[PDB]
Amino acid sequence: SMQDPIADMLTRIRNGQAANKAAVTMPSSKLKVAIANVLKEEGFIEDFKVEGDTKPELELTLKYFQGKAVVESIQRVSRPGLRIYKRKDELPKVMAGLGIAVVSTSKGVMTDRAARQAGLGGEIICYVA
């Protein structure tokens, strides 16, 4: 069974980058769209496009810069088998602040730095480097 859609999405992105695919599509969800927005804002992908009504498909346009993938690494962290929540003081710094960590806070899904500025922790969905 599919047991983790966010994880699946991340993997899809990684494989697309590996195989140099221009875009990657998957069943859309609200959490997925939010994650995509965070990625776009932070600049790890070029674009996302949700398309359809009954079963809509999110389509991300991946980002390349010198023949190689912009998203160097991208791991899910809080996975279903083991949820991870951090307090604002325990929020991780990925790649010494270069990479980002998408964190689901009380005020919506946001990057780790933004969450820290706000002053709240939450479920750490994934790290991106």
């Binding site: 600049g43 790890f44 980002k63 790649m95 270069l98």
Partner: protein, 156 residues
């Protein structure tokens, strides 16, 4: 200006109809102290020759590393055959807290402040392989800015 130092020299044998043929392998590592490091693995029937071969090899195919103020840019892992290595930037004045081979490559590279450990196998050749890979696979804030299409101030 291209400071070089030999990590390990090891004698290896091949067997023939007659008896054993001994020979020496020299693992050297050179670097300019500003980022550039290159390792070389020479083999010859006697040690000095082996060392010379290693030095020549090392001198070519060196590799530049984006170093931040005499230390690493972020915590970096490195893997290879067995030698899996972890290395973390540390505050100025800590000095290089790093194993043997690892210490050599880092030192010639020009990193003055690191905390390293070699996990897994500690086979000098492999550990050097791991360390160089790890150092290379490390981008700077300039590079990340370039990749993501932002300014360095937006990233911090």
């Amino acid at each position: 200006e291209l400071q070089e130092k030999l990590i390990a020299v090891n004698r290896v044998s091949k067997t023939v109809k007659g008896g054993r043929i001994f020979s020496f392998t020299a693992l050297t590592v050179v670097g300019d102290g500003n980022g550039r490091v290159g390792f070389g693995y020479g083999k010859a029937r006697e040690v000095p020759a082996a060392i010379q071969k290693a030095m020549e090899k090392a001198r070519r195919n060196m590799i530049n590393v984006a170093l931040n103020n005499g230390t690493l840019q972020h915590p970096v892992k490195g893997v290879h055959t067995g030698s899996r290595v972890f290395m973390q930037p540390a505050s100025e004045g800590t000095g290089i807290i790093a194993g043997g081979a690892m210490r050599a490559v880092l030192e010639v590279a020009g990193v003055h402040n690191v905390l390293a450990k070699a996990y897994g196998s500690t086979n000098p050749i492999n550990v050097v392989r791991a360390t160089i890979d790890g150092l290379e696979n490390m981008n700077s804030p300039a590079m990340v800015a370039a990749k993501r299409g932002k300014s360095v101030e937006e990233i911090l």
